[PDB]
Amino acid sequence: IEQPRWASKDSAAGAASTPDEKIVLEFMDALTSNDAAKLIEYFAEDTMYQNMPLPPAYGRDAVEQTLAGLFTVMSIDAVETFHIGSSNGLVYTERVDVLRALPTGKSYNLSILGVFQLTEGKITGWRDYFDLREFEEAVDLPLRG
Amino acid sequence: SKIEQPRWASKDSAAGAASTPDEKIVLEFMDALTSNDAAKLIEYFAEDTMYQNMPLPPAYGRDAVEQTLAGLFTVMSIDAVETFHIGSSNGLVYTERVDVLRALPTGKSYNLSILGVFQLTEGKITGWRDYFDLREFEEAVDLPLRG
Ligand SMILES: CCCC(CCC)C(N)=O
Ligand SMILES: CCCC(CCC)C(N)=O
Numbered sequence: 001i002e003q004p005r006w007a008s009k010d011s012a013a014g015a016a017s018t019p020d021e022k023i024v025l026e027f028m029d030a031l032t033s034n035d036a037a038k039l040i041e042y043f044a045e046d047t048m049y050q051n052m053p054l055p056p057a058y059g060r061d062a063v064e065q066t067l068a069g070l071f072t073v074m075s076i077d078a079v080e081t082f083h084i085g086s087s088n089g090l091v092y093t094e095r096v097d098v099l100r101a102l103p104t105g106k107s108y109n110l111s112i113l114g115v116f117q118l119t120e121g122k123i124t125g126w127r128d129y130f131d132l133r134e135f136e137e138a139v140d141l142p143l144r145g
Numbered sequence: 146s147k148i149e150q151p152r153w154a155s156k157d158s159a160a161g162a163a164s165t166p167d168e169k170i171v172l173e174f175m176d177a178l179t180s181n182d183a184a185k186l187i188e189y190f191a192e193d194t195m196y197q198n199m200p201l202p203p204a205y206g207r208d209a210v211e212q213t214l215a216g217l218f219t220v221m222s223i224d225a226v227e228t229f230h231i232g233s234s235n236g237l238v239y240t241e242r243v244d245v246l247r248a249l250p251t252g253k254s255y256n257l258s259i260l261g262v263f264q265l266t267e268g269k270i271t272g273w274r275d276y277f278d279l280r281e282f283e284e285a286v287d288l289p290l291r292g
Binding site: 005006008010012013017048052053056058083084085086087088089090092094111112113114115117125127129130131132133134 | 152159235
């Protein structure tokens with residue numbers, strides 16, 4: 001993971017400054033588990049998850065099944081969060097996820113900006129924004145196609 | 146070019162309104178985007194600045210930024226911007242929105258979901274990065290911007 005020119009070099013960049021930000025960075029560390037059953041414990045029952053290029057999942061079961069599917073085709077090898085911030089119940093993370101496509105063995109560093117809504121320390125929404133095509137082309141996996 | 150309020154919209158009012166001076170300028174800037182006017186819009190930027198639509202290469206410096214905006218407004222109109230969520234920490238403002246984009250060659254429109262980040266220094270933009278999926282827009286409006 002190379003540090004972007006535009007990324008803060010400040011010691012507190014990417015560091016949690018509130019309880020919700022702390023939970024979100026714990027969740028980022030947990031992504032490299034590639035384990036949907038572990039991850040789903042961060043979510044509220046009334047919840048949703050969406051990789052924005054693709055349809056959303058609503059409710060905890062749909063979220064879990066979506067993560068389990070994703071982890072059947074790819075591994076999150078590494079996550080680095082350059083920037084984190086929050087206001088009014090929403091946490092934002094500017095990061096890179098290093099993804100490896102299991103069918104092809106090829107990896108790509110995916111640039112993501114994501115938003116997390118937490119209610120009493122549980123995730124009520126998680127939406128990640130990124131370009132899907134560039135990932136698909138890098139790793140020869142037509143996730144949507 | 147109606148924008149639908151998402152099922153996932155925050156029910157906290159402060160989440161949808163500018164709560165700091167920097168957030169207020171960002172929302173003024175979002176209002177201005179419908180001008181389709183790169184010369185007007187560039188006044189929001191510092192001389193030392195950068196802009197990137199994340200599917201595409203970054204522009205560094207105010208002139209490169211202006212030239213990029215001018216090119217974009219040659220091929221598309223931003224017909225509307227709605228910002229559902231705005232917040233900030235550590236000198237960065239984040240906006241979750243939909244921009245309604247219309248391709249000038251084809252007359253076709255698309256509602257593009259975007260999450261963007263802004264860095265402001267003394268009220269001027271020093272960085273702006275918008276994250277979104279480019280392919281869905283290109284296919285919707287028949288404009289292979291990247292291809
Ligand atoms: C389960 C993780 C999904 C990926 C992006 C999918 C293309 C990510 N957030 O790194
Ligand atoms: C000039 C504005 C660029 C567009 C997206 C380009 C594909 C936007 N921010 O709505």
